[PDB]
């Protein structure tokens, strides 16, 4: 090494200063930000009563931590169609807002639930924008949403003035004017009631059986995060040289403990040289003590 740092094959007597001596670290630990409250996804995914397709709910869900790994057992969905994000990486993404909606339709109009579609259900009942991102979840619900004699609990509009705007619900109740005769109301020739009722029955095969569909809408706007993922990885180390993936430190030390009487709402320590010497612990709230190799 002495020959290498002098670029010669002969070294006269004396004392030389070769390269630096440094202890390399080992292992690695990770943390997650200081969010703990979990998201109640069980209401949307499992509800005793569902409103009509025209009465679909536009609800807001936020201010929690979403666990997408637990919903796989909450419904027998198999499609799990996604457009703007991979289905596997929905946990480590932070989103400010989460959109949830649920309604009941007929099976023949389930594949039609997608951007760029038009027709019976994509123009009179449900429309989505072209730049949609997120995922689509659907499953069969024949055995708990159909009656052999007849189920009239779900109504769907089929006459409307035009194709309604996306992200909107039209709940107008009036008799469509489909003729020269003035359709004042009630019923009559050339005046048809648009609210035709479903007739879900076990006699129906694939296409007419009642199904259930849920879609989650996200947007990657530049707003502060509100709901994120969990995951723990390694617990803790006490006296070792380890790497960090903490809540804003990413240090590398032998952090053991801090016995100082630190102020409650203060996390990151500093010194006369502006060096971080303290870490807020996400779980025990115990301040650590940065110390190099």
């Amino acid at each position, epitope marked *: 090494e002495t020959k290498c740092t002098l670029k010669s094959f002969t070294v006269e007597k004396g004392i030389y200063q070769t390269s630096n001596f440094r202890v390399q670290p080992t292992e690695s630990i990770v943390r997650f930000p200081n969010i703990t409250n979990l998201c*109640p996804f*069980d*209401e949307v995914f*499992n*509800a*005793t*009563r569902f409103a009509s397709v025209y009465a679909w709910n536009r609800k807001r869900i936020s201010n929690c931590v979403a666990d997408y790994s637990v919903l796989y057992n909450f419904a027998p969905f198999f499609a799990f169609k996604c457009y703007g994000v991979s289905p596997t990486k929905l946990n480590d993404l932070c989103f400010t807002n989460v959109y949830a909606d649920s309604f009941v339709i007929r099976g023949n109009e389930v594949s039609q639930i997608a951007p760029g579609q038009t027709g019976n259900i994509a123009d009179y009942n449900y429309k989505l924008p072209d730049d949609f991102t997120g995922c689509v979840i659907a499953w069969n619900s024949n*055995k708990l949403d159909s*009656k052999v004699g007849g189920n009239y*609990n779900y109504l769907y509009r089929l006459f409307r003035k035009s194709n309604l705007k996306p992200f909107e619900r039209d709940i107008s109740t009036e008799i469509y004017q489909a003729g020269n005769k003035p359709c004042n109301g009630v019923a009559g020739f050339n005046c048809y009631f648009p609210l035709r009722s479903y007739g879900f029955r076990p006699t129906y095969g694939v296409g007419h059986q009642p199904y259930r569909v849920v879609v989650l809408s996200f947007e990657l706007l530049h707003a502060p995060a509100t709901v994120c993922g969990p995951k723990k990885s390694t617990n803790l180390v006490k006296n070792k040289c380890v790497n960090f993936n903490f809540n804003g430190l990413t240090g590398t030390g032998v952090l053991t403990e801090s016995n100082k009487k630190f102020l409650p709402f203060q996390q990151f320590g500093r010194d006369i040289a502006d060096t971080t010497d303290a870490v807020r612990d996400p779980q025990t709230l115990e301040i650590l003590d940065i110390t190099p190799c």
Partner: antibody
Amino acid sequence: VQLAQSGSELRKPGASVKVSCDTSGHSFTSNAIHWVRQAPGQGLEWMGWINTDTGTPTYAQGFTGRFVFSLDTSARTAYLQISSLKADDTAVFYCARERDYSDYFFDYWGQGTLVTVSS
Amino acid sequence: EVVMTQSPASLSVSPGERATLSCRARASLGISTDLAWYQQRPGQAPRLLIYGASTRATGIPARFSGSGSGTEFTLTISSLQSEDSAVYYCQQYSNWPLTFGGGTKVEIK
């Protein structure tokens, strides 16, 4: 309201107990009949139900494996079977039936059956 | 799941006085008045008294009257008699882990 069930029975520990529920006394607009288990000195604990006219049982978290749900050929009466009886498993079993379709309140209830696991 | 909470655990008041039984369920988004009230006399099976928000089943006396919406529910019975000495349970049929409350034992002095 006052549906008929089986009478009080005494069974040795580890054996099987037969429990029935008469339901054909009225007309019910429901495809489900439920069973309720009550602790001797504690609160109620929902156990499960079996799909009437379909024969598909529905078990709870702690009421599966040893608890058996079954129906009859005529699909009118409901039966309850419990095996591997333990000393602390003694309880009073009740039979309940809802009133309206898609309405899950137990409007009609059985008379009740009491079993004892002792010597 | 939902672990349904009922307080107080037991009540024993003089007959003829309304007794409020707090029946609060751990529902984050609410239950939408999907509550049912059952009274269980020792021996025979529990009997349903109130289904829904406040309306009672057919044949149920008007004394048993309940209310509530979403998370907070309260049942009030007017003019308690000796035949009302039983245990009252409330159930929320919102999702499908069908479970009942802890049970409040009502005693007649």
